[PDB]
Design a protein around this ligand. Sequence first.
Ligand SMILES: [Mg+2]
Lengths: 237, 135, 254, 67, 190, 97, 79, 169
Amino acid sequence: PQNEYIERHRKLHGRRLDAEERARKKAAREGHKNSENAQNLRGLRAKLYAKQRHAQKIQMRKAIKQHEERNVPSDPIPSYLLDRANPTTAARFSVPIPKVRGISEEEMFKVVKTGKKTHKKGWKRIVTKPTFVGPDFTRRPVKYERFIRPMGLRYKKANVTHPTLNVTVQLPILSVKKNPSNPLYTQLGVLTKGTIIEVNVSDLGIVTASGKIAWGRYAQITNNPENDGCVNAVLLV
Amino acid sequence: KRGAPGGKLKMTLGLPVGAIMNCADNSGARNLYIIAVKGAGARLNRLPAGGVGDMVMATVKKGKPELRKKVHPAVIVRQAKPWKRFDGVFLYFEDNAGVIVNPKGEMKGSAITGPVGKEAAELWPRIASNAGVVM
Amino acid sequence: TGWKDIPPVPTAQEFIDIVLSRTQRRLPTQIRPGFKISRIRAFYTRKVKFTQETCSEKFGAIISSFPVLSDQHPFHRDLMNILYDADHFKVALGQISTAKNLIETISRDYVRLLKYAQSLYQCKQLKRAALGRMATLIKRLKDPLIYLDQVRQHLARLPDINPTTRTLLVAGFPNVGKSSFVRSVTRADTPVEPYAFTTKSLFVGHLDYKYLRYQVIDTPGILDHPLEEMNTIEMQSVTALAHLRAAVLYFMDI
Amino acid sequence: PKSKRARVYHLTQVNKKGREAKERLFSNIRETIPKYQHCFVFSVDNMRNNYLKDVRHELNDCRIFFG
Amino acid sequence: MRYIHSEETIPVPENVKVSIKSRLVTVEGPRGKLQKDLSHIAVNFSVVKKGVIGLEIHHGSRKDVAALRTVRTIINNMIIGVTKGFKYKMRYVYAHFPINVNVEKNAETGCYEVEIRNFIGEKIVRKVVMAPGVEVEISKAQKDELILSGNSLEAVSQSAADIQQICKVRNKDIRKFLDGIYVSEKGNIV
Amino acid sequence: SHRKYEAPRHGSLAFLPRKRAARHRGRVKSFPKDDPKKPVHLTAAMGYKAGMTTIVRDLDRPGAKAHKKEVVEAVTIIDCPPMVVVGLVGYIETPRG
Amino acid sequence: AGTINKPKKPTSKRKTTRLRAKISKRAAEKKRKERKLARKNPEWRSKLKKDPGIPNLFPYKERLLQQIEEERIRRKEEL
Amino acid sequence: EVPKAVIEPNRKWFTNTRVISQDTLQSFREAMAEKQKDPYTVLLKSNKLPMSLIRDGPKLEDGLKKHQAKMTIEREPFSETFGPKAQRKRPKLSFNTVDELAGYSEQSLDSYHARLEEKKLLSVATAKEAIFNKGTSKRIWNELYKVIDSSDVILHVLDARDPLGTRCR
RNA sequence: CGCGGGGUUAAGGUGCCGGAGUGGACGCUCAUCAGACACCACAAAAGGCGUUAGUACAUCUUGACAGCAGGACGGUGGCCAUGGAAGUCGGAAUCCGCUAAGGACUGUGUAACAACUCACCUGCCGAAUGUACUAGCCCUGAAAAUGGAUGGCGCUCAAGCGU
RNA sequence: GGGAUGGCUUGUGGCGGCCAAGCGUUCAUAGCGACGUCGCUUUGAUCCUUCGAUGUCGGCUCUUCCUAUCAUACCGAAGCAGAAUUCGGUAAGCGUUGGAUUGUUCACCCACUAAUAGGGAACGUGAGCUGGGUUUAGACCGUCGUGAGACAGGUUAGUUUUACCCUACUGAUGAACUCGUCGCAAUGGUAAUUCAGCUUAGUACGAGAGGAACCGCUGAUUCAGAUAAUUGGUUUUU
Ligand SMILES: [Mg+2]
């Protein structure tokens, strides 16, 4: 068969003789079936069913309210900026997150054991949090490497949000300025929550009052990168 | 359609996986190394094995270099392990030998050297047409 | 042969539900905080890898089943372009391949992080982050999946036309008797009606002449205006006439 | 009664008339009373009554109430 | 809430004899006799008037009040069955293989039997044994039509449902394959 | 943890315990269900196993490969001298069997 | 489901001492935490709560409204 | 022990750490244009520079082809192209006249035959032996990246009998 | 809190194991592993065409809610678009007449019409209903892996829940 | 000389902004806020970017359990023509296999197959057999140290050796009731499984290519219970 052959078979022969009556009776039994599903499903299937029915009820209420109310940009922009996807756009020099959970050295570092004996040497410490190592990085030789910052935990970019512009851009990390838990964590370059980092802001296009281009600014990390797999930061503007 | 034929009575399977059998056709191969048997079931540690009239998958260990790189379907036509027919005869051939075929059972070569078994001849009509002696 | 063996293309929400239900039900779900950290890492790593493998299998099945436009005969390539915009076809399949690649990249990154995670809570957060990022990537594919499902159904119902056989190509104006002739000489069920453009797609029937199989192609009608003013329905007939080495039968109603 | 028939909210333009239609019919009949010399009462029992439109169009100088 | 008294009524035709004893209802008419045990439902039966049966429930809940409606419809259906009877007309249609329907009456059991052959070319013979009191005939006024008649509406309709359900297409597209036997009409014999 | 490769258990638990039979003579645990419409007939017999031998059968099995052919089959010989009927036992039905 | 013919492992209602003590400790800690959150709650609260009023189905509501009106008239006259 | 993790208020958080002028940018752009490669010089310390403002932009063909897909989808959405609510009527053609169509069909058939011939010129086979996967294992490449991360100078050793064969690009 | 006898209680209990009530009054609840020592989590402003008690708003002999019998029209195939597109593939408008009332249309349907149907109106009928929330009790609201646990039997106008 | 988190967990990311039914507030109009949504994270490409063992896994041999079902049974939906499937539901009765690779997180490849589903009973320390983490004493090589020696490390060789006890389990006897024959059946156990071929039929269905199923018949896989006429094996028939 070719093209719309089921529709052509419908046109030439119809359906089964009881199709309309069976469809009407099933649509009539739908209410009892839905109540039975609400009262008799179990577990994760019942939880997903309840969430999905909650969604349908909210949507139906919105549609009914809109039909009830049937009988009744924000910032000024130039004409060439009309009909475009524009952002909503929403002394004490305090940062947005002035206090975070402190990280103990036991949580920060884990002991790496060395040696072939049953009793092992334990002077090496591995950093368990994400780090930034900077440019032109070459690792220390293994005999003199106390702090291990593993390769798979090293980051170079961050999703940085500008509070005024309501714009999030991925920016390169320039340095790590202050980890609030420890100056040693600052020196190791640990990226945890509340850490002040320096970011390349060339993409944001920031011009100073004297006409110079600002390409380095400070941002505070606002998430838990070891849990999230990424670095989220907010510019300090 | 998988290559295990239907209507085959139970017989003793003399050739497990890893057996090197002779090549009874003129396809250029001289021996066949069995790596699998069509229709073999699932049992812990049991080697899949085949008998006369069974389809196996085989690699060529000796012969033309063009056949050495492929896994060919083959039909076992002769076996040396004695087996019984329904007429009560226990019988065996002097060697183990098979012929290279396609999945449809048609032969790759054009001639068969030596005799073939009744089971192989009855299950595969192309082997029956290419058989000089059927024993 | 045709394109009836393309697997069905789910929507984005159905795709997410299928993949996450496979991960939930084909793997163990119970892990304890008191277990060894290597055991917990293996559990969550297996979750991430299995989710990515299911996504990769489904996306590769979608990609490898659809026709490759550059590998078709020019008749089939041009007809596919007339039926569905070839730019849209290639863009949808490219988005599918890009999403598959991005999901594999996300899986590799989060497996690498789970190598270094230190607690069940951190492992759980990393696994949820990986799965949620895959779900966001799939949610971004809502419109290409709908488009590809429609195209798959049409391709499955497309007639099989051999461009390198004996073919009789029946063409002409609407309402001149093309479908009547094809019905009279073949077994094809092409409708015959008095209104114009009754036939909106290519139909093919077959006949035997001197123990040889001939195929006969019924076309939609063609109007008298330049090529830029033809719609897709007439452009199917124009494509067949341009690319099929056939015997053309131009029908006239005097 | 938890077990009840679900009431269908109609997403259509026209709503139920209510008492305003009754008051409008009252006012229309009472204001058409003083303008005419005769008031006939007619019956159409078990009939389709769609030809009353044609009757209204033909008797354009008259007023017809079918309420 | 408990309702002190609730009541339903059933009119009885002049040619119908109704006897109720311990909630066992026997209805006799020109067409025969039907029986039904309603001892699973609490109800007080009475004769409120000539030709009227009264049903009542005392101190019942809403469910107990509502059950009298089902009892009323059951007894009314028995009265209609013994007066006019019930008839279901079924039609069997096919595409290519003509469905063969053979109707016999088993002398040992007194029940009718329906044999269905060649349903979409199948070699099996389908056999449906009808409920007792259900008469099956092949129509002569129309084409490919069976007529089921009886006094018990439940027996007639369940027999028709069995005939409909035995001819079921499996593992095929039901948009394309339209063969089957379907109830085409429901009504009274008289 | 779970068994890595599945395998069915060795032997059937239907034939437990694997102990010696409590009697040398076989016990008919169940007799065929009685039908009073049938004529009277005995349901069992006894014999002594003598040994085995070989036969050739002219097979009539339509559909089989050995149809209309000769088949060699093993058989068992049971020596059956006639029995002597010496008693009659009657059995009633109780709620204990 | 096939619950009747093949029931599954039962869910025990027999409590353990460890779980009872843990639940009691968690309930007490939740009570203390809720008291602290209510102490530090910044949500606005009215000085006078909203009154439900008189129910409509009370058959002498109109007479009660009359009595309220005469009482407030007498209070305004006295003051 | 759990420390107190607090950031003090400071005016330095809200200033620009690094600034650059247009003259310095122009000098760096000219240096970027004029710079050449010397095998006998090595890089010892990178200058921290805003390289996005100094590097030359991509080619215009690459820039247009990078956005052509989203431009086509913004012009015609998928629901308007094919489907139950599609409004597409005129196809996009690479030809304008009937003579151009005839020529296009001729070259399309020629290119299709050429592609088929080159594909033809270019029993299932046995699996590739696992010995030929040696040197590609995750453990070996973990060792390689560990060595690369540890080293300042990398000696790439080549066989003089097959230098380009043993070169690792 | 010395060794004994008698009497009375506390916490807790009185269907049997088990001493003491199948004790009394008014209700509620039926669970496909109810509940009986719960408060914590799962868990949400959660999902229930389970069952009661209420609160607010609204319709109603000028006839409410449900049905049945009928009407559901005219300018008009409104504009643009489309090979075709007439309320019903789309984009945008969405007004007037006749009105008792009837959308420049809610769905089925046609290639497009037709045809059917809904919103709304009239006739028959006949007395109370509708919506949304609140509070009780009940169901769901996630479970692994030997066979078992309100302590056990068991208990359904309780031997469950509240006073 | 002492010593050896847990009614946890599961399927749907984080950060920032907006909207928002509602909660509150209505001498302040703030503060919470489900449902959502928006921004950061190749025209089917590239194949010249594999990113760190402190945490250790194994294999036989055998039994049982869970269901979160891969296959088999039944069912609901889908342009599901047919064939082949896809998504979902009930269901654990019954199965779920050889093999290659130790320059190595041994995980992936190949094949057969109806299918090659996932877990627990250890790993919330732990005497069955035997390989890797793995490590007493002998020895080189690398790194560090003036050295004894230690280790970033790599290699080689290297002693635990019950059972006759109690219980459990598998089988075998048995006192008391005279000895014996024939029986009953409470209770415990319980068993079959999957594929193929012939016919239906080149039929239904289909433009064509292709292409079923029910009834009927015959074999085979895996499992189970027996048996020794035949054929092989075994020989102290010395
Ligand atoms: Mg025409």
